[PDB]
Design a protein around this ligand. Structure first.
Ligand code: IYR
Ligand code: IYR
Lengths: 322, 322
């Protein structure tokens, strides 16, 4: 019964919002390297800061020796995840999502190692299995395992069903089945036994754990990272100018760097934990140092340098100074 | 603004449970012959008495000069209609339903005229369009027009969502979309503007009217026939021996004939109206005659003869006496 401390280490960073059976997950992680998955839906031709914590978290797992599967939702992006959203998401055309899928895949790759040991990353696209799946097969083979009674009290969509000013299409109501089947499929072909996701993904993830159990009798796990918040209560990664994109052509490395310099003192130390690979020891020493220096805090500059390098590499960091 | 009296004539027989915009439907019917549809799901290799009133009602429309489309649910029978049902219907295999589809089509044909004028009958199978429809197309192109909030308060499934001892799979919850799209598709290819169905079909039918409106901007109509009841409160067409089948190999014409002879005095005159083509005038005179004869009622014998001939022809009637 060895027990892995990886979940504890992430908890210490404040990076675990919810986790299924943390005791059993920690024991499984100590048994050896696992394949895990984190996914992103092509809702734009680029990811932005709201996708960064989960993405880096997938990298933290790889660095701990596990194998990351980076899934891009070629099919789920044609449907739209309603989870904790107030209104129906825009339906994009198949041609546009396909192009966005490619853009996101290429943008995600540099963050993971695709050529190292047995823990090399794997790129996945759920369009591989839903793209040509026929409706009767879906409704019967996947659909019979879902109780609508359970689906409607899922927290993620409850509000869309209870408030009047907030309905939900059958299209988005079905999304939970698609993402639940993705977990079963990834477990079947790649041995994925852990799914990590954003704060709003609990219900989608647990539907995947249950369906994996139902379809393959394998126990799998899920973990969500927290909704990143600012002490002043405003929305993180949201500016007058819109989202802060990970694509240098949409948001320049210079502007990306400026966004991090602009971090509030109240948020900066927490943000070093969520967005960088500096040890907890070093971040605490840095906080203590700023507390006693009588100088401007060095933390914003450190945060800006670290995340800008992570996202745009040494070249982006240099472009941030010209 | 001519007005057709066909709906009135059916009302007089006690054959109209609910009808959408009866005034506009009656005017449309007076404009000229229409294409209408009644459908049957392959839940067995034969229809039984519970399907007879709607089937004969399709024939009453044809006799009034309209064109009947007899739809057999090659795809909907792979899903299962939950309407006013207490529990999940059994999922049958594709091979078995396909064989049942053929059996039902052939059994329905003799009841309609496929070779007369411009009002010759048309056989349809929704497997033609759902059989190969891909899931993303279904969820997006059909699914975006359905509000889950509306779907859950449909009377037909409300009980499955409210009672605890009664859940519903996403599989059966989706059925309403399939039958709603069938109406739009039949309106598009055959000009069908009226759907008739059993008593439990109101919600499926209205979903079809709404989706036809949404997809093609055409106003179409629906009508349901009543749940046939017996004065003693027991279930019509249900015996110790099970259902009363329309297939002579499952329920012999002799036994079929005996079932009608066994009709209660309290039900027989109503049953002559629902199950035969005798005029209302003649049925009333027959009731008056039995009231004053001092003889056994002739009505059961007349009912037995008429329905047995309708269902098994002159040959079945003769076999009923040997
Ligand atoms: N619904 C997720 C994106 C996503 C989609 C499919 C999938 O299998 C997985 I793992 C993740 C989100 O919106 O973050
Ligand atoms: N749900 C119906 C059968 C049926 C199925 C599909 C369809 O388009 C039509 I019109 C009728 C019943 O159970 O009676």
């Amino acid at each position: 019964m060895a027990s892995s401390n990886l979940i504890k280490q992430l908890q210490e960073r404040g990076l675990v919002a919810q986790v299924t059976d943390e005791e059993a997950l920690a024991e499984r992680l100590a048994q050896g390297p696992i394949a895990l998955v984190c996914g992103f839906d092509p809702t734009a031709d680029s990811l932005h800061l709201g996708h960064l914590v989960p993405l880096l978290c997938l990298k933290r797992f790889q660095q701990a020796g596990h194998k990351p599967v980076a899934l891009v939702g070629g099919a789920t992006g044609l449907i739209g995840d309603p989870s904790f959203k107030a209104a129906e998401r825009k339906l994009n055309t198949e041609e546009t999502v396909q192009e966005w899928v490619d853009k996101i895949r290429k943008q995600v790759a540099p963050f993971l190692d695709f050529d190292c040991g047995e823990n090399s990353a794997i790129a996945a696209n759920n369009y591989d299995w839903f793209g040509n799946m026929n409706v009767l097969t879906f409704l019967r083979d996947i659909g019979k395992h879902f109780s609508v009674n359970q689906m409607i009290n899922k927290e993620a969509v409850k509000q869309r069903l209870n408030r009047e000013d907030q309905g939900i299409s059958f299209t988005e109501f079905s999304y939970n089945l698609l993402q639940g089947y993705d977990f079963a499929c990834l477990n079947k072909q790649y041995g994925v036994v852990l799914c990590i996701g954003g704060s709003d993904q609990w219900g989608n993830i647990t539907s995947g754990i249950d369906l994996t159990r139902r379809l393959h009798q394998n126990q799998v796990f899920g973990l969500t990272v927290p909704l990143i918040t600012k002490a002043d209560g405003t929305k993180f990664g949201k500016t007058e100018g819109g989202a802060v994109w990970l694509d240098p052509k949409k948001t320049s490395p210079y502007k990306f760097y400026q966004f991090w310099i602009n971090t509030a003192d109240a948020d900066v130390y927490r943000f070093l934990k969520f967005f960088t690979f500096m040890s907890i020891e070093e971040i605490n020493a840095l906080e203590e140092e700023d507390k006693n220096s009588g100088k401007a805090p060095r933390a914003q500059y450190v945060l800006a340098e670290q995340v800008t390098r992570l996202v745009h590499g040494e070249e982006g960091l240099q472009a941030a100074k010209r």
